[PDB]
Design a protein around this nucleic acid. Structure first.
Ligand SMILES: Cc1cn([C@H]2C[C@H](O)[C@@H](COP(=O)(O)OP(=O)(O)OP(=O)(O)O)O2)c(=O)[nH]c1=O
Ligand SMILES: [Mg+2]
Length: 726
DNA sequence: ATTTCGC
RNA sequence: UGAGCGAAAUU
C-alpha cells in the first residue's frame, strides 16, 4: 500500500496505462484478453517499481494422526475435491419440483430495470464504497489501487463490461480464486472437516458482482418473503428471537401440549447448492435476458486453488456450490432457499400452531431455519420427506446430529415414539439461537440468559487486570467490548429486571474502571457529554430504558412486514398496540399477565411521556386512522381520500377554521369528502382544546417516533433524549 | 476511521 | 493471518 502512495509512481503508472491502452486497439483480439495482458503488465511493472524502490532505500482417512507435510496436503486436497465434484445432472427432474409450487414473478418494469446497460455512474458508487485495508486477491491487486486510479479506469472498464454484456463471456482471470484454511470457533482441530474454507477473488470480479448484487437487491424485498431476515436490508436479528419467545410462551400456557420446535441446521449449505438448480430457479423467477446471460457465464467454469502455509496448490474445478466470498452469492442462496420456504408454507400437511388470527409456520435466517409444528407424529415426517426431496433436487443436506429440538407433550408414553422415530436430538434445558439460550420454560429466561452474562463479565474483567493503560483506556475498552454484548441481550430479550442486576453490573464496571481503586472524579460530571467536559460514562439503566421504549416506533409505523409484534397472547379483544401511540386513552382494558414484552414498553412510554409534561393522546402527529375520530361513527371510504390526497397526520387535514380547506388542492378536494362526515369533522375541530392541542410546535421526542421513517440510529437518539431528560 | 454480534 | 452479507454502537 505504501508503493501506491508515491506521486511519481502514480504519474508513471497513469502514463503507462494510457500508452498501453492507446497502442494495440486492434480487431483480432477481444477486451478480455487485453484486460488480462493489462493485469500481467501491471504486475510486472509493480514488481520492477518495488525492486527500484528497495534499491533506492490432522487425521487421515484411517483416523491416524499424521504429521507428514506431503500426506496432509494429499488428504485435505482429496477431501475438498470430493466436496466440490458431485454435480447433479437430472435436469428433467429439477423442473418437476418447480412446476408444483408457486413462485413470485417480476413484472416488465422490474426486468427492464434489471437489464439496463451499466453506465459510468453505476461504477463510481461502487469503487468509492469499496472497503479498504483488506487482503489482496489472487492476482495481487488491492481495492485502494482501483480507488486511487479512478480517473481513467472507469471509462475503459465501462467498455470492458459492455463487451461482457454484448458477447456473454468473461476473462479467464475472472475465475481464479484462493482458498485459505481457518480453525473454527470451538471445534477440535484434528478433524479435516472442522476448517473454514474462505475464498478471495479478483477486485474487478468483486466490482461486477457488487453491481449485479445491488441491481437484484433493489427488488430482493419483492422477491423473498419477510420471514427471512438474513442478508435482507432493513431487518434485524431479534425479529425472530422475540417471535420464538412468544411461541414458547404460547406453548407453555396451552393446556393441551402437542407441539414441537425444531432448530434445523444445514450442513455446509453454501458448498452444497447445485449451480444448475440455482440457474433454473433464477430463470423461473422471471429474470431472463442480459442478467441471466451474464449470471450463467459467471458460473460456467469456476476454479479454485487452495493455499496452505504459503503453498501454491494446484486448482480443481468447483462443479458445485456457490463460491463463498461473492457479494452476489448470499442473494442467490436466499432465492434458492425461498423455494423450500414456500414449499413448507404452502404445504397443508405441515401444520403450524395458530396465534389467534395469525398463523406462524417457520422462521428463517441464513441457515437457522427453525420451524414450529403441531401434531409432530405426521408433521415431522412430512417435513423430513419434503426436505429429502429438496435435497435430492438441489443438494441441501441437514446435519441431523447438530439439530436440536423441543418436545412439548403431556403423556409419558407418547414422547417415547416421537424420540424413537425422528432422529432429532431432543434437548431438555437450552438451545442456542444466535447467542440466545431459548429456555424450554419462559420463567427461566432471566436465570439462563442474564446470570451467565454477569458470570462472563466477572471472568473477562479478571482477564484484563494487568494492562498498564490509562483509565480513559479502560473506559474505551468497556465502551467497545462490554456494551454491545449487553445491548444485544437487551434488544433480544427486553424483560423486567430487578435492580440488583443493574447494581452489581455497575459495581463490576466501576471496579474495572478505577483499577481496584476509588473514584477520582465525580461520576455525574464524567457521565455528561464531551462539551460539558465529561467522557460520557455509559449508563446501562438508560440503555435498557431506550431499548424497552424502542418498540413504540414499530407500534406507530404499523408496518405489515413484521409479525413478531402480533404474536402476543391475548384472551381479550383484538390488537391494541396499533391504537396506543399518540391516540385516545382507552379505559377498561388492562394488559399484562399474558404479556411478557409489550406491557412493560407501554409503562415505560407513559412514564417518560409524563416526565416530559406533554400530552401524548392528542398531538400534531396523530393519525387520521386513530381511534380519536372513529369512536364517533364515520365511513371508511372518507379516510383513504385524504390519506392519498393530503397525508396521514391530523394537522394537514385541517383544524379550527382550516377544516379540509388550507391549500388550493385541499380547496378542490373539499367537495370530494361526504357532507355527513364533514359536519362531524368540523365540529370536532371547532373545539378550543382540540385547536390548542394540535396547533403547536412538536418536540424532539415526538419527531423521534413520528417523522423519521428509518431505524438507523433509533437507540442512539432515544438514549440521547433520555440522557438529556435524566 | 473503528468496534461487536449473527450467518 | 482473515474474505462476504446484514444488523447495532462511538466519534
Ligand atoms: C461464520 C461464517 C459463515 N459464512 C457463510 C458460509 C456458510 O456457508 C454460511 C453459514 O455457515 P454456518 O451454517 O454458520 O456454518 P456451517 O453450516 O458450515 O457449519 P458446519 O461446518 O457444521 O456444517 O455463512 C461466511 O462466509 N463467513 C463466516 O465467517
Ligand atoms: Mg448450517
Amino acid at each position: 500500500n505504501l508503493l501506491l502512495n508515491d506521486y511519481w509512481v502514480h504519474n508513471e503508472m497513469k502514463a503507462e496505462i494510457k500508452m498501453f491502452f492507446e497502442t494495440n486497439e486492434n480487431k483480432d483480439t477481444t477486451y478480455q484478453n487485453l484486460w488480462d495482458a493489462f493485469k500481467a503488465v501491471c504486475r510486472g511493472k509493480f514488481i520492477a517499481l518495488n525492486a527500484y524502490k528497495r534499491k533506492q532505500e490432522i487425521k487421515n482417512d484411517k483416523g491416524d494422526i499424521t504429521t507428514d507435510p506431503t500426506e496432509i496436503q494429499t488428504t485435505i486436497r482429496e477431501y475438498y475435491k470430493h466436496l466440490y465434484a458431485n454435480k447433479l445432472e437430472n435436469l428433467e427432474e429439477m423442473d418437476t419440483f418447480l412446476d408444483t409450487y408457486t413462485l413470485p414473478r417480476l413484472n416488465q418494469e422490474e426486468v427492464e430495470s434489471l437489464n439496463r446497460p451499466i453506465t459510468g455512474s453505476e461504477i463510481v458508487a461502487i469503487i468509492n464504497s469499496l472497503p479498504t485495508k483488506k487482503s489482496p486477491g489472487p492476482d495481487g491487486f488491492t481495492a485502494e489501487f482501483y480507488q486511487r486510479y479512478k480517473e481513467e479506469l472507469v471509462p475503459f472498464l465501462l467498455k470492458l463490461f459492455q463487451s461482457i454484456e454484448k458477447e456473454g463471456i468473461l476473462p479467464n482471470s475472472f475465475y481464479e480464486a484462493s482458498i485459505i484454511l481457518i480453525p473454527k470457533p470451538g471445534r477440535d482441530t484434528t478433524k479435516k472437516e472442522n476448517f473454514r474454507p474462505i475464498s478471495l477473488m479478483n477486485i474487478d470480479a468483486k466490482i461486477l458482482n457488487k453491481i449485479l448484487a445491488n441491481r437484484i437487491q433493489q427488488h430482493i424485498k419483492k422477491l423473498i418473503h419477510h420471514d427471512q431476515v438474513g442478508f435482507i436490508p432493513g431487518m434485524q436479528g431479534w425479529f425472530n428471537i422475540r417471535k420464538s419467545i412468544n411461541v414458547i410462551q404460547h406453548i407453555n400456557r396451552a393446556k393441551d401440549k402437542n407441539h414441537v420446535i425444531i432448530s434445523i441446521d444445514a450442513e455446509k449449505a453454501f458448498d452444497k447448492i447445485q449451480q444448475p438448480f440455482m440457474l433454473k430457479t433464477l430463470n423461473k423467477l422471471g429474470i431472463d435476458g442480459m442478467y441471466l446471460k451474464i449470471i450463467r457465464a459467471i458460473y460456467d467454469k469456476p476454479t479454485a486453488n487452495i493455499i496452505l502455509n504459503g503453498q501454491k496448490l494446484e486448482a480443481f474445478p468447483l462443479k458445485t456450490g456457490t463460491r463463498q466470498g461473492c457479494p452476489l452469492s448470499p442473494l442467490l442462496f436466499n432465492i434458492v432457499l425461498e423455494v423450500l420456504a414456500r414449499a413448507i408454507r404452502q404445504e397443508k400437511e405441515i401444520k403450524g400452531i395458530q396465534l389467534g388470527k395469525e398463523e406462524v409456520k417457520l422462521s428463517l435466517f441464513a441457515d437457522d431455519m427453525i420451524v414450529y409444528l403441531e401434531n409432530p407424529i405426521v408433521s415431522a415426517q412430512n417435513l423430513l420427506k419434503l426436505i429429502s426431496n429438496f435435497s435430492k433436487v438441489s443438494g441441501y443436506k441437514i446435519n441431523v446430529q447438530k439439530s436440536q429440538a423441543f418436545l412439548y407433550n403431556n403423556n409419558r408414553q407418547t414422547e417415547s415414539q416421537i424420540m424413537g422415530e425422528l432422529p432429532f436430538t431432543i434437548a431438555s434445558k437450552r438451545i442456542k439461537y444466535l447467542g440466545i439460550q431459548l429456555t424450554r420454560d419462559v420463567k427461566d429466561l432471566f436465570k439462563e440468559n442474564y446470570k451467565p452474562l454477569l458470570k462472563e463479565i466477572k471472568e473477562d474483567t479478571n482477564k484484563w487486570k494487568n494492562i498498564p493503560c490509562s483509565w480513559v483506556g479502560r473506559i474505551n475498552i468497556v465502551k467497545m467490548a462490554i456494551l454491545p454484548k449487553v445491548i444485544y441481550r437487551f434488544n433480544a430479550i427486553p424483560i423486567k429486571l430487578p435492580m440488583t442486576f443493574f447494581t452489581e453490573l455497575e459495581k463490576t464496571t466501576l471496579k474495572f474502571i478505577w483499577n481496584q481503586k476509588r473514584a477520582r472524579i465525580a461520576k455525574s460530571i464524567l457521565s455528561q457529554k464531551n462539551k460539558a467536559g465529561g467522557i460520557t460514562l455509559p449508563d446501562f439503566k438508560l440503555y435498557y430504558k431506550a431499548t424497552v421504549t424502542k418498540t413504540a416506533w414499530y407500534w406507530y409505523q404499523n408496518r405489515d412486514i413484521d409479525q413478531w409484534n402480533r404474536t402476543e397472547p391475548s384472551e381479550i379483544m383484538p390488537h391494541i398496540y396499533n391504537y396506543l401511540i399518540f391516540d385516545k386513552p382507552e379505559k377498561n382494558k388492562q394488559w399484562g399477565k399474558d404479556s411478557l414484552l409489550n406491557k412493560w414498553c407501554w409503562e415505560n412510554w407513559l412514564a417518560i411521556c409524563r416526565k416530559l409534561k406533554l400530552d401524548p393522546f392528542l398531538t400534531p402527529y396523530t393519525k387520521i386512522n386513530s381511534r380519536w375520530i372513529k369512536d364517533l361513527n364515520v365511513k371508511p371510504k372518507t379516510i383513504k381520500t385524504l390519506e392519498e390526497n393530503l397525508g396521514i397526520t391530523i394537522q394537514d387535514i385541517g383544524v379550527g377554521k382550516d377544516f379540509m380547506s388550507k391549500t388550493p388542492k385541499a380547496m378542490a378536494t373539499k367537495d370530494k369528502i361526504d357532507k355527513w362526515d364533514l359536519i362531524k369533522l368540523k365540529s370536532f375541530c371547532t373545539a378550543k382544546e382540540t385547536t390548542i392541542r394540535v396547533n403547536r410546535q412538536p418536540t424532539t421526542w415526538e419527531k423521534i417516533f413520528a417523522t423519521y421513517s428509518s431505524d438507523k440510529g433509533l437507540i442512539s437518539r432515544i438514549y440521547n433524549e433520555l440522557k438529556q431528560i435524566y
